[PDB]
């Protein structure tokens, strides 16, 4: 009560985006280094890196992806139905997302 104005809400939105931008900087540097990772010369030292494409099957990845998309969709449904639903009726969605 009496503290959460529009300025405070905008401040917390900015704080969220700033934290996730900070955490995405070091990860971005590591990803860039991962892309052009160092290796031995292809001529005599490392003749096999031509065939080391490191390609992972997309079918296995797709079956891996199910819980994350599930929680995303459940969270959207939880936030949309908050307009006309109570707390005890939404505990089902909250508990499902928790599990």
């Amino acid at each position: 009560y009496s503290k959460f104005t529009a300025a405070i809400q905008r401040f917390w939105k900015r704080t969220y985006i700033i934290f996730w931008v900070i955490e995405a900087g070091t990860f971005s540097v590591f990803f860039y280094l991962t892309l052009n990772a160092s290796s031995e010369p292809v001529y005599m030292y490392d003749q096999i890196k031509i065939y080391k494409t490191h390609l992972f099957s997309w079918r296995w990845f797709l079956i891996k992806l199910l819980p994350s998309v599930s929680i995303i969709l459940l969270g959207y449904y939880l936030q949309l139905t908050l307009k006309w639903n109570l707390f005890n009726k939404q505990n089902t969605i909250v508990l499902l997302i928790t599990l």
Partner: protein, 125 residues
Amino acid sequence: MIWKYLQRTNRGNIIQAGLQHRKFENLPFKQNFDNLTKAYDLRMWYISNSPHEAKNLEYVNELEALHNELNYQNSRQFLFRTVSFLLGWALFYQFYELPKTYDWQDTQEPKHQVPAYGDLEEGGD
């Protein structure tokens, strides 16, 4: 000749389109998504083109109510469709015979698994 059907623009492309009366005659006896969308579109077009303010403000209130009701209908649609999609995804991968016969050369690096430069990695000559 050619200008009659190449340069003479059609009437419909110029004037404003009229209401399609076919789509408001036989309506289902339901407050479904189709009927709610029709009401919302009617009131939005009216307030977009009407010089009368009393009817416009009445339609604004009714449009807010219709927005809430259409949000509810869309929530139902989203729940049903996405739950069906997730269950179908899970069932497909439950019945699908996953190909586990892919090449495993990527995991094997014989020069690194057994270091070919053994006893020479440390400086010795």
